[PDB]
Short mmCIF file of C-alpha atoms and ligand atoms in Angstrom, two decimals:
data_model
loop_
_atom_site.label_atom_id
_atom_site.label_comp_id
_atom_site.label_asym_id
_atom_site.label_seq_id
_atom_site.Cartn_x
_atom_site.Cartn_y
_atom_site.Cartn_z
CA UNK A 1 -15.66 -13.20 25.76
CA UNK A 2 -16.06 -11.54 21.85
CA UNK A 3 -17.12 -13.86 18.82
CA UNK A 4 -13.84 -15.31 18.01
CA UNK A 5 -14.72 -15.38 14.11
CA UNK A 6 -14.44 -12.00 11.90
CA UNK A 7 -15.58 -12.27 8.10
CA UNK A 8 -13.06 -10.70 6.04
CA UNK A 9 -15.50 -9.16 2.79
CA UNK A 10 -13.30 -9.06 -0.04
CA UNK A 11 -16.09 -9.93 -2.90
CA UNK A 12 -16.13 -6.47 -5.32
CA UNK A 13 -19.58 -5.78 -5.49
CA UNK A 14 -21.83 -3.93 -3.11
CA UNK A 15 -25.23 -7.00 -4.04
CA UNK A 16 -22.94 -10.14 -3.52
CA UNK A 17 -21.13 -8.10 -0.39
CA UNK A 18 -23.86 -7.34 1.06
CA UNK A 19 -26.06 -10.64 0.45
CA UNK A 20 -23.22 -12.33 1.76
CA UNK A 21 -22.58 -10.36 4.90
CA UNK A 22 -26.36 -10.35 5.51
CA UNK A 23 -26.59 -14.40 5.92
CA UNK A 24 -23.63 -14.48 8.28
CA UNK A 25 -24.97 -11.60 10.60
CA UNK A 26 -26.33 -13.81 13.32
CA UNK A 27 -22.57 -15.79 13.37
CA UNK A 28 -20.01 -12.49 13.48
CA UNK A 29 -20.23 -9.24 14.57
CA UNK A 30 -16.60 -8.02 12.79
CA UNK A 31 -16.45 -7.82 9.45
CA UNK A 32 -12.93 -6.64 7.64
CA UNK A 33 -13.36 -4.44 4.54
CA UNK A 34 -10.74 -4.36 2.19
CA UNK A 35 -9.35 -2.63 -0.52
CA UNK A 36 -11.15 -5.18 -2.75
CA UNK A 37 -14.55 -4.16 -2.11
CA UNK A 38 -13.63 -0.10 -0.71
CA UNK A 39 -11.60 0.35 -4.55
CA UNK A 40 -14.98 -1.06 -6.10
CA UNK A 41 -17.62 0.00 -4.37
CA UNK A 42 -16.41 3.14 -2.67
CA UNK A 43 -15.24 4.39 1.05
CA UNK A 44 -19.09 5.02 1.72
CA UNK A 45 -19.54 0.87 1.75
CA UNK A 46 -18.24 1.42 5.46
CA UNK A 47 -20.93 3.25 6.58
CA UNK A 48 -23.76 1.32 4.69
CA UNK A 49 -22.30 -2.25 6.32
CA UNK A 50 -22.49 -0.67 9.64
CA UNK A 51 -26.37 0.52 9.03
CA UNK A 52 -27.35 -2.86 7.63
CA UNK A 53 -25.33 -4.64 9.71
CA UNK A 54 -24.56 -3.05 13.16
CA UNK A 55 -20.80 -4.78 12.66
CA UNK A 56 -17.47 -3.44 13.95
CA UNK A 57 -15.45 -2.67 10.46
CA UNK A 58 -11.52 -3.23 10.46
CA UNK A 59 -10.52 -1.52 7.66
CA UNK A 60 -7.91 -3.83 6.12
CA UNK A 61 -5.78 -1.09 4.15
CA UNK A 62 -2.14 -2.59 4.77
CA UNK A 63 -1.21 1.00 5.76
CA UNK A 64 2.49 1.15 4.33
CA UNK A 65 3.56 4.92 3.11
CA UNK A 66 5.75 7.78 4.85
CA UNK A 67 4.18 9.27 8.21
CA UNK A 68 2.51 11.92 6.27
CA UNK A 69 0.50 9.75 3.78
CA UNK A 70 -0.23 7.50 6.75
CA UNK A 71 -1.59 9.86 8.93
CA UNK A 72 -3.91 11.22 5.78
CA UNK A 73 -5.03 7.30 5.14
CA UNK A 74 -5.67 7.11 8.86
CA UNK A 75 -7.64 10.04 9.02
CA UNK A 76 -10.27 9.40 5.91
CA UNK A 77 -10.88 5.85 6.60
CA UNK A 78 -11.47 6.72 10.70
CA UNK A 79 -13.81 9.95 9.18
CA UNK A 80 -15.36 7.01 6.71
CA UNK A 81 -16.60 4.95 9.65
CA UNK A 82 -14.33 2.28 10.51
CA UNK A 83 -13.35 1.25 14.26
CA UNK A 84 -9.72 0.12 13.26
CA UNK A 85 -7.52 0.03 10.52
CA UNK A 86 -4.55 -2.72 9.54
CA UNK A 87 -1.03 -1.19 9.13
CA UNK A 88 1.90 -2.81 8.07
CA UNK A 89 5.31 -2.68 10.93
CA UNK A 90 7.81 -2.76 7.85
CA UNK A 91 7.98 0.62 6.83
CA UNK A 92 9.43 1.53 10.09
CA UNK A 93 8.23 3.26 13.57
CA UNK A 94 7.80 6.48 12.54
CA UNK A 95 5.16 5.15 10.15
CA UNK A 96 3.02 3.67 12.65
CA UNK A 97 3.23 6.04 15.40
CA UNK A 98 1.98 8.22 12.63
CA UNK A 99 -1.42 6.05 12.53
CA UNK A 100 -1.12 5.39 16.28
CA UNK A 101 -1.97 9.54 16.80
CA UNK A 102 -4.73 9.70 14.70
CA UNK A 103 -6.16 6.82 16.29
CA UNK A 104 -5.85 7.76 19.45
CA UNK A 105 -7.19 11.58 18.49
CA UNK A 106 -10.32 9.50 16.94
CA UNK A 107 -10.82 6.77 19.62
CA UNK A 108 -10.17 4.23 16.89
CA UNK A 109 -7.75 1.08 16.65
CA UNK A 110 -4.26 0.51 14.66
CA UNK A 111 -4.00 -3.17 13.73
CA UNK A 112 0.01 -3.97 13.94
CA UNK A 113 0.85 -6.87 10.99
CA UNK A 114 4.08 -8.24 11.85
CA UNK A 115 3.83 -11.66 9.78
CA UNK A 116 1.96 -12.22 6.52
CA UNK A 117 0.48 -15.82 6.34
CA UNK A 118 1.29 -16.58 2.68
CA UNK A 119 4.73 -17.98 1.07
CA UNK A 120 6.32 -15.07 0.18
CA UNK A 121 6.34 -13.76 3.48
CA UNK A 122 8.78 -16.08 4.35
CA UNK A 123 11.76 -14.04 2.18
CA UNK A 124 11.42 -10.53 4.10
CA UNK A 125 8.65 -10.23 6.65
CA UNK A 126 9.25 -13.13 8.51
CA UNK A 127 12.88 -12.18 9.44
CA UNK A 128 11.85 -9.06 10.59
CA UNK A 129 8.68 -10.07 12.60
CA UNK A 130 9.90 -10.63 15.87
CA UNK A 131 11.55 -6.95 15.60
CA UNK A 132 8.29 -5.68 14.72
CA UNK A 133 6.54 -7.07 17.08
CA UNK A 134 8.98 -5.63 19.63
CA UNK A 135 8.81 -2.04 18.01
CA UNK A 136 4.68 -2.63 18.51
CA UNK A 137 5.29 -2.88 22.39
CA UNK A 138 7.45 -0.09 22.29
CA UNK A 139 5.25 1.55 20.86
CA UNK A 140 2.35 0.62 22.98
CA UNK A 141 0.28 -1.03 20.80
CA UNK A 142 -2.00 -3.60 22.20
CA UNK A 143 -3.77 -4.96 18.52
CA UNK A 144 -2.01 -7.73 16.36
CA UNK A 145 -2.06 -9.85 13.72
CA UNK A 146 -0.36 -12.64 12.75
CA UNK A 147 -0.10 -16.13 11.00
CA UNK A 148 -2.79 -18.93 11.02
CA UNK A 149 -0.44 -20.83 8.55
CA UNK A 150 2.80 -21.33 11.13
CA UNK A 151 1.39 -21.72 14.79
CA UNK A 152 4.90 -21.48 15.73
CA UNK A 153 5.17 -18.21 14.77
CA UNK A 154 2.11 -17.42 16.48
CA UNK A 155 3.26 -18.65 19.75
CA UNK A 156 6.20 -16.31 19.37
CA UNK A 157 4.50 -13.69 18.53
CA UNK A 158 2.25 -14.37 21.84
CA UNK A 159 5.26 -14.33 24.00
CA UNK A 160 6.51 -11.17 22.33
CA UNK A 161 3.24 -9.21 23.23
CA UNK A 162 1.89 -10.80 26.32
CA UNK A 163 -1.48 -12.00 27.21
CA UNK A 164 -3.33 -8.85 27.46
CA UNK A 165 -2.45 -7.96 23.77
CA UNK A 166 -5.34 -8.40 21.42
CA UNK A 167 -4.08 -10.85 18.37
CA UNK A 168 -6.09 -11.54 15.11
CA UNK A 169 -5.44 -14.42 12.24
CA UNK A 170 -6.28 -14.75 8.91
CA UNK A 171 -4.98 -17.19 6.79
CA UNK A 172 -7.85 -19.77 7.89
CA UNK A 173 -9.75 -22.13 5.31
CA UNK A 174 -8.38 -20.94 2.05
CA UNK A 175 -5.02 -20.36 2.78
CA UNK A 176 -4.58 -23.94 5.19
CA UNK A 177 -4.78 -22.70 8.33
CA UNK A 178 -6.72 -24.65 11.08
CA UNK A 179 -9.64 -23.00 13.15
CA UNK A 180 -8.67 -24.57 16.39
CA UNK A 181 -4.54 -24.49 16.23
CA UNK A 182 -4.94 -20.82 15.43
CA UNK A 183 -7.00 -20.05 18.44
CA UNK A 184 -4.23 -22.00 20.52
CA UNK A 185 -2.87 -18.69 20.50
CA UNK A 186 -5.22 -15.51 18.39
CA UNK A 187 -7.89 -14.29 20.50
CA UNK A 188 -9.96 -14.41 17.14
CA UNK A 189 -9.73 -16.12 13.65
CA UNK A 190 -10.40 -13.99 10.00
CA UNK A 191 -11.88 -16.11 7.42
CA UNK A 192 -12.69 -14.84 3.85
CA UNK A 193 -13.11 -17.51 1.27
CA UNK A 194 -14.42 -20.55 3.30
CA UNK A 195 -17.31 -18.67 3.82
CA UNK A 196 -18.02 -16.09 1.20
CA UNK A 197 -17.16 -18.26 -2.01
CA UNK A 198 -20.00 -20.51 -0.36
CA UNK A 199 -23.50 -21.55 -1.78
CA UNK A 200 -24.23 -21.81 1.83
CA UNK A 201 -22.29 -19.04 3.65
CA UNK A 202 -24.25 -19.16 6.95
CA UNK A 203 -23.93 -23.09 6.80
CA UNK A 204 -20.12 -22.33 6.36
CA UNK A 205 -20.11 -19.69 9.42
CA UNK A 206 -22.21 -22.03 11.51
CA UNK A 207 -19.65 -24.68 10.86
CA UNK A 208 -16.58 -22.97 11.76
CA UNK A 209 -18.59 -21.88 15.18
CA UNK A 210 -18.85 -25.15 15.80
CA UNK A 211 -15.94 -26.36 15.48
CA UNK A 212 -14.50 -23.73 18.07
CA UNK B 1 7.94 4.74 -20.54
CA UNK B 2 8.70 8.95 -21.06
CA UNK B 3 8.11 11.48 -17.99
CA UNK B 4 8.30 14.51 -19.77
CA UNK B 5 10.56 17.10 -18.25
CA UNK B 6 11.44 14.60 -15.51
CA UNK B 7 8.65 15.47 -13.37
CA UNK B 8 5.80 13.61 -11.63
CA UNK B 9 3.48 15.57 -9.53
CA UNK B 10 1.93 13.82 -6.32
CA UNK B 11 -1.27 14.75 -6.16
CA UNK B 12 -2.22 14.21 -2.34
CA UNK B 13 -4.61 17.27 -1.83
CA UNK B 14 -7.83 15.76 -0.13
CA UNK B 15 -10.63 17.09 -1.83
CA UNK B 16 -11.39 17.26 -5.75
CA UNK B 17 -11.87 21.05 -6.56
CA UNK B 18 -8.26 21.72 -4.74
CA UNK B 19 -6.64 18.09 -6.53
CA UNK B 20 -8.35 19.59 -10.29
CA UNK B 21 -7.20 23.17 -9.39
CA UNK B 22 -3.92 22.24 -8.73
CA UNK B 23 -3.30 19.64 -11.28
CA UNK B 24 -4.91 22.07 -14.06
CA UNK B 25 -2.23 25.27 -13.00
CA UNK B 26 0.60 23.06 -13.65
CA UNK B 27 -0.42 20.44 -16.69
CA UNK B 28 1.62 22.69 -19.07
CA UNK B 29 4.71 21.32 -17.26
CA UNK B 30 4.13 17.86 -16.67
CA UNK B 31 2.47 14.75 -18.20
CA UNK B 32 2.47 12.04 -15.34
CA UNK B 33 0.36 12.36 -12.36
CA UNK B 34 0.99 9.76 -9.43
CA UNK B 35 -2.75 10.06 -7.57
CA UNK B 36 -2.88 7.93 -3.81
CA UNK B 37 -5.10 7.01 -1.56
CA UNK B 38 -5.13 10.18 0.46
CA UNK B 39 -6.96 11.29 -3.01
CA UNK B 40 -8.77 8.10 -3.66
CA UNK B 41 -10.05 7.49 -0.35
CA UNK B 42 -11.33 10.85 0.13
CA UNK B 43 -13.26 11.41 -3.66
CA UNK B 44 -13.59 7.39 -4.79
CA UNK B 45 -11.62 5.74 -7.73
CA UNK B 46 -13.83 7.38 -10.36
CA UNK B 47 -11.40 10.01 -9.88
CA UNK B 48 -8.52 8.65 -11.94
CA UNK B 49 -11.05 8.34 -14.91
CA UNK B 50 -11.29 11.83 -14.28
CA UNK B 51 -8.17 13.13 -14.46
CA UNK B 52 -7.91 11.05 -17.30
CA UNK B 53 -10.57 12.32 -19.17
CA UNK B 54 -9.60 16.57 -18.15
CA UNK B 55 -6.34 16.23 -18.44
CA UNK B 56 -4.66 13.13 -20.50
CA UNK B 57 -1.85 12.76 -18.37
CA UNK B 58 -0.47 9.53 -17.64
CA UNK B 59 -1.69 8.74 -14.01
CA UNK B 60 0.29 5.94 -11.70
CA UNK B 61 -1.81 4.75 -8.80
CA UNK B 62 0.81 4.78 -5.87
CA UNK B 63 -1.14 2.73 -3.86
CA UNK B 64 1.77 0.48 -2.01
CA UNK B 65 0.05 -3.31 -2.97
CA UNK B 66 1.10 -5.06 0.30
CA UNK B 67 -1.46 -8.13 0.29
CA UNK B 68 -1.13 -11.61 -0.31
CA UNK B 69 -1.82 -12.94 -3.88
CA UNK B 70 -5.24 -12.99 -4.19
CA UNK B 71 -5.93 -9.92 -2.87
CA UNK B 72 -3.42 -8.16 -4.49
CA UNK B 73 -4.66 -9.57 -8.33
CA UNK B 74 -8.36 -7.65 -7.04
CA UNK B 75 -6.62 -4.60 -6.51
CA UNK B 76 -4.73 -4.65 -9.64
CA UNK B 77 -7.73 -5.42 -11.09
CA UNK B 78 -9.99 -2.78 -9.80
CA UNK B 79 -7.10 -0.21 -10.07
CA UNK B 80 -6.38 -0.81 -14.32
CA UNK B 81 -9.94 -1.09 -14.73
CA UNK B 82 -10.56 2.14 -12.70
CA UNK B 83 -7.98 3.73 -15.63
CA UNK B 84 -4.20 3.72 -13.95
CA UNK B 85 -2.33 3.41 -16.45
CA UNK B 86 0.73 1.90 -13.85
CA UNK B 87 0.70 0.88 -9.82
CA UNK B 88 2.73 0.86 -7.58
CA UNK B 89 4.02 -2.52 -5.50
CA UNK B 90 5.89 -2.69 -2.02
CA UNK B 91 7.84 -5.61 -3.03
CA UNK B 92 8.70 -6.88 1.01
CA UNK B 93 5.54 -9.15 0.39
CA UNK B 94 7.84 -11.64 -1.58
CA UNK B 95 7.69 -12.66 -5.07
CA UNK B 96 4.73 -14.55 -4.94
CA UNK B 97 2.68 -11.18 -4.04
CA UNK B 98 4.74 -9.07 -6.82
CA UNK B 99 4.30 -11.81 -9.15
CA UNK B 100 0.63 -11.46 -8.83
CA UNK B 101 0.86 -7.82 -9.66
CA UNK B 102 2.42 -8.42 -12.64
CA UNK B 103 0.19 -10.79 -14.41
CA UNK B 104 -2.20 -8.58 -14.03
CA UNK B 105 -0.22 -5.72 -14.99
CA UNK B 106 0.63 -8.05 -18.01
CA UNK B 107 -2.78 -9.47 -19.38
CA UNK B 108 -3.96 -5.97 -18.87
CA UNK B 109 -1.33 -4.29 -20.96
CA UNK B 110 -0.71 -1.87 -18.15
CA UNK B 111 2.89 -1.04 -15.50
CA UNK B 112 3.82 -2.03 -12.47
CA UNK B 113 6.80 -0.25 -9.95
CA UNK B 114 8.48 -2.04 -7.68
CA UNK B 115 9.44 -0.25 -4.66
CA UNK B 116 12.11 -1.25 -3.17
CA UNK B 117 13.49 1.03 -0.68
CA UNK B 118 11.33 4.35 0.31
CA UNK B 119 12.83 7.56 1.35
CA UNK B 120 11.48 8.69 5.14
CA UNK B 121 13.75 7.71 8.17
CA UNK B 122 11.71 5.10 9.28
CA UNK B 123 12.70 3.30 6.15
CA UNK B 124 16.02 2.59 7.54
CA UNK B 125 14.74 -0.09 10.01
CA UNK B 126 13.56 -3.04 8.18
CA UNK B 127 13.09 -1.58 4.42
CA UNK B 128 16.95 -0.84 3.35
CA UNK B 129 17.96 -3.94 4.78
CA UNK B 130 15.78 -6.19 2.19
CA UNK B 131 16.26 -3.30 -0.93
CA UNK B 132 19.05 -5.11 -2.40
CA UNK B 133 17.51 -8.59 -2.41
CA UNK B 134 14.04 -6.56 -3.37
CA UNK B 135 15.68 -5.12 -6.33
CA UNK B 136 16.94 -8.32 -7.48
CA UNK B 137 13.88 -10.79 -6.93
CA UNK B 138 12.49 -7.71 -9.56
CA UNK B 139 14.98 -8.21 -12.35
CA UNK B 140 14.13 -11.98 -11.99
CA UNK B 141 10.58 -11.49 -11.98
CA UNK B 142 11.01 -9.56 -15.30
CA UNK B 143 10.16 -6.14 -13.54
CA UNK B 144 10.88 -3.23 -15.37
CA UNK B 145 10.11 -0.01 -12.93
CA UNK B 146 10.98 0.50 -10.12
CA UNK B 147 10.71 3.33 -7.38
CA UNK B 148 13.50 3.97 -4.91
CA UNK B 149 14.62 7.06 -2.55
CA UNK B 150 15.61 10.60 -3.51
CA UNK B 151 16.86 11.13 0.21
CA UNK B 152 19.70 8.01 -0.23
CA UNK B 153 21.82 9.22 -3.80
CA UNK B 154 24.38 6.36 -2.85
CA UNK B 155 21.53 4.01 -2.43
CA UNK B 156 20.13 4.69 -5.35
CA UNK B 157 23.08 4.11 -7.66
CA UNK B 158 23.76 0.83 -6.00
CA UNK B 159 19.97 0.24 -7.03
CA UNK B 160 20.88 1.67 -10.35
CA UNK B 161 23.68 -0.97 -10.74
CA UNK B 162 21.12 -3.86 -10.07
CA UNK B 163 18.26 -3.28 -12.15
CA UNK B 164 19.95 -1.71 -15.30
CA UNK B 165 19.54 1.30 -17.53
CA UNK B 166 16.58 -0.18 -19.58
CA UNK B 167 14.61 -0.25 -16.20
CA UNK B 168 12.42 2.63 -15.54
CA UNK B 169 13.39 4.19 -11.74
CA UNK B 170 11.55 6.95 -10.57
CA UNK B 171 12.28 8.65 -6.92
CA UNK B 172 10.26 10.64 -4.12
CA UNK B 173 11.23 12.34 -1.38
CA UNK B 174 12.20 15.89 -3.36
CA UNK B 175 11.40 19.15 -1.64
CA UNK B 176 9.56 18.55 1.70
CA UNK B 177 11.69 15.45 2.39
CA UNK B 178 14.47 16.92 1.80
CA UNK B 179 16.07 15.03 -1.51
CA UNK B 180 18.78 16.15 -3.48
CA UNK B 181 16.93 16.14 -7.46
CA UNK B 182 20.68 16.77 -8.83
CA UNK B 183 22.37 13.90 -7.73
CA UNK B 184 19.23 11.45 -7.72
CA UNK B 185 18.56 12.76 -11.82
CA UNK B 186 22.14 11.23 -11.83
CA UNK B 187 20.77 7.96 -11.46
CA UNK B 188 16.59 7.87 -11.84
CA UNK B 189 14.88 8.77 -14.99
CA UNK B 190 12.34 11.05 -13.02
CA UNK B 191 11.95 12.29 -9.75
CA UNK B 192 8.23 12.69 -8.10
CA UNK B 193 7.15 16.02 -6.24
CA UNK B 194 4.18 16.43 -4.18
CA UNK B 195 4.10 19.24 -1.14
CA UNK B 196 6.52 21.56 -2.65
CA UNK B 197 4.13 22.46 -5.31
CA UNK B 198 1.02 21.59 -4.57
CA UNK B 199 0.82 23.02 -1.32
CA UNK B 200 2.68 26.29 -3.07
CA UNK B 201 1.44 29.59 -3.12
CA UNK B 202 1.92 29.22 -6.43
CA UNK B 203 1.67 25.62 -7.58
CA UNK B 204 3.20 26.75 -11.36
CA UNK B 205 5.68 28.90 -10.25
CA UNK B 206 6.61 26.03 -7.70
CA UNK B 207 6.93 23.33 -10.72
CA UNK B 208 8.21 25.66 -13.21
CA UNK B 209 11.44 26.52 -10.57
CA UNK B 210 11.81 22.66 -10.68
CA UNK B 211 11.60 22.32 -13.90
CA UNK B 212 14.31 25.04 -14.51
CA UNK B 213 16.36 23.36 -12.04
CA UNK B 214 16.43 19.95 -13.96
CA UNK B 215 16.79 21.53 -17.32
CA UNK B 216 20.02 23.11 -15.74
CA UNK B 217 20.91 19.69 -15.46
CA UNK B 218 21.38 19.32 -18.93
CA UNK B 219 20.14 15.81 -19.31
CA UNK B 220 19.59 14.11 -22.96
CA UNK B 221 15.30 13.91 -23.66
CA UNK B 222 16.83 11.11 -25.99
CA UNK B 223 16.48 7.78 -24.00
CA UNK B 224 19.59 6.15 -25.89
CA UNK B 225 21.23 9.42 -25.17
CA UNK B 226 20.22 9.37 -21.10
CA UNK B 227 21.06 5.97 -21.26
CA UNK B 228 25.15 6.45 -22.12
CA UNK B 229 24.67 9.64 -19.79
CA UNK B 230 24.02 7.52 -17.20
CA UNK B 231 25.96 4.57 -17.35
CA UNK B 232 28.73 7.25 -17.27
CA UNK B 233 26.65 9.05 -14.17
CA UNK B 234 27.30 5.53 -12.13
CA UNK B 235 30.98 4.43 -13.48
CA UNK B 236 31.61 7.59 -11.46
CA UNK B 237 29.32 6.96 -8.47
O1 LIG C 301 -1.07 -12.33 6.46
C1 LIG C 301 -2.18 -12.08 6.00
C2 LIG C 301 -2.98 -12.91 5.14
N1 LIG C 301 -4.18 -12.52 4.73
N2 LIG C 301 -4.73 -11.30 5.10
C3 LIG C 301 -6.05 -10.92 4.66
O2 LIG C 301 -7.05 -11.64 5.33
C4 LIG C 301 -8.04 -12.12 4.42
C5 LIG C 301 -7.87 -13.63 4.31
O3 LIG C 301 -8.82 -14.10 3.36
P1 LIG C 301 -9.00 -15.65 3.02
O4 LIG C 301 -9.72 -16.31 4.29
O5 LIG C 301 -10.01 -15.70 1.93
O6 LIG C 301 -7.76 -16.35 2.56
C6 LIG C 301 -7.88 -11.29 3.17
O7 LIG C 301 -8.60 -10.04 3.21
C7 LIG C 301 -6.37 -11.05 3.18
O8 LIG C 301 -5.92 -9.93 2.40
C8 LIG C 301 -4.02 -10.41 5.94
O9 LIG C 301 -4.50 -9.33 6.27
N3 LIG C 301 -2.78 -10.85 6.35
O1 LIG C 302 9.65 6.13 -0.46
C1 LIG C 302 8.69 6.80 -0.72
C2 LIG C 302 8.40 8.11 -0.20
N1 LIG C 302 7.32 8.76 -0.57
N2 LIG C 302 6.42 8.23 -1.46
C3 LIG C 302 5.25 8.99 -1.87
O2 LIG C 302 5.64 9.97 -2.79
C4 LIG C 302 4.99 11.22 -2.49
C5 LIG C 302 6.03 12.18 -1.96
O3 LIG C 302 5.36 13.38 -1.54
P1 LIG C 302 6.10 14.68 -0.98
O4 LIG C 302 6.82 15.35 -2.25
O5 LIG C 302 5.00 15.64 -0.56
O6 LIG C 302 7.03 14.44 0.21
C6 LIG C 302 3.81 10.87 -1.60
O7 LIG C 302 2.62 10.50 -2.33
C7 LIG C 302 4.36 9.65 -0.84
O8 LIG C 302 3.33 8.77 -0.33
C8 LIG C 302 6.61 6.95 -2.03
O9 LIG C 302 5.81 6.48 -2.82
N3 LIG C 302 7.75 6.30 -1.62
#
């Protein structure tokens, strides 16, 4: 099945981004731009990763705004290159059916979030994250992400959306989570820091592929 | 912080020559421009510098910061540096992701608004639940602005009540969303337009209606002034 590891790019500029990225080709063929690196180096970085690179680009933009600002975020960064885009479930429905039609006009991908790996998402998003994952089969999506750091939470969140639902987590390496608990339940793991703080980032990549 | 005449334009055109246009035909009436990423992701950050530069209006990034931590002190970073002079946070993160925000915000000598409930329908599903407890984790994180919605009056005086009348609170959802600017001036310091004049036929005759509207309101320009006005505003409410 796909490479189970996507690089999540947030260094801010376009020679260390792109150095980087370069030594892991051979190890992932998804990389996640951010807002770190797009507010930086510009929207056009999309384009220039997938020249260089020939990588899949999940546009990690937290989508979070009314339906009409979504649907306006949606439609630049889908224009700007990228094959799917990261939206948050809190704002409500509306707001992500709102990305869900421009994807589906574009042929692109909306990302559900429905829990944040990090301590503060314990206060509001976790309470909620079970509801959102509901409203994202409702909905019909079939992309999620959720938690390396509780693999509890995961394994709800894998009964909530089924087997057939695609489910991605971050919060591997830096943040504590473990390569192989994660992938207990995520079809595929995002790692950032492990491997692009690195002397050695391909030695980092090639790790983590070896340990799954 | 002073919004003068009580009005922040939302400048979510798409393309540069419309956003300039748009922003130039009604600078005479306002001095705080709230720029997004419908802008931003379209034209590249370098536009804040220059709407800074043409116009030297005070611009607020509403970029809705909804990352962990670390990625939400690059953001900050990239966004002060880029010339915002305040941006704004979704505060259902946690503290630990506003907090972030705000160090920034603080060794950078710049603002950051907390938003803590937002003024489409949708909002009413998991955001007004958590506004309450969101408005509160910002008074003890030492936040002092904070965005809530024009389309909710009652909501916002309750919001009012928590975060005090030294706290900045500006509101959306005026004009295309349908928001009542009387009775939300009765409680926010300044409420923030976008379709309803810049997608006008007439973007100055648009803001300048507004503008006449508020003034009708007959609200003190003298913060210590607004500030008994509207304690009195929400002993009523
Ligand atoms: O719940 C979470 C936690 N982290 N991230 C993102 O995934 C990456 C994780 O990076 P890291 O491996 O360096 O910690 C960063 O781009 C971060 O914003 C999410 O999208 N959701
Ligand atoms: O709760 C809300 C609602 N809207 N907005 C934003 O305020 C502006 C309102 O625009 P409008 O006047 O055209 O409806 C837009 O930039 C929108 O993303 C917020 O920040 N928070």
């Amino acid at each position: 099945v796909m490479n189970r590891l996507i690089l999540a790019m947030d260094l801010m500029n376009r020679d260390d981004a792109l150095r980087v990225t370069g030594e892991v080709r051979e190890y992932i063929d998804t990389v996640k731009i951010g807002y770190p690196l797009v507010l930086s180096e510009g929207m056009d970085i999309i384009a220039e990763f997938r020249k260089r690179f020939g990588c899949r680009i999940i546009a990690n933009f937290k989508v979070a705004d009314i339906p009409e600002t979504n649907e306006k975020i949606c439609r630049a960064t889908f224009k700007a290159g990228a094959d799917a885009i990261i939206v948050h479930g809190f704002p409500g429905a509306d707001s992500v059916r709102a990305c869900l039609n421009v994807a589906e006009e574009m042929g692109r991908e909306v990302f559900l979030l429905t829990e944040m790996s990090h301590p503060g998402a314990e206060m509001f998003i976790q309470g909620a994250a079970d509801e959102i994952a509901r409203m994202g089969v409702d909905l019909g999506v079939k992309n999620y992400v959720g938690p390396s750091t509780r693999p509890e939470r995961l394994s709800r969140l894998r009964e909530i959306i089924g087997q057939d639902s695609f489910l991605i987590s971050p919060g591997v390496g830096a943040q504590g989570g473990d390569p192989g608990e994660t992938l207990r339940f995520a079809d595929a793991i995002i790692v950032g820091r492990s491997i692009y703080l690195a002397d050695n980032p391909a030695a980092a990549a090639a790790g983590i592929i070896e340990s799954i």
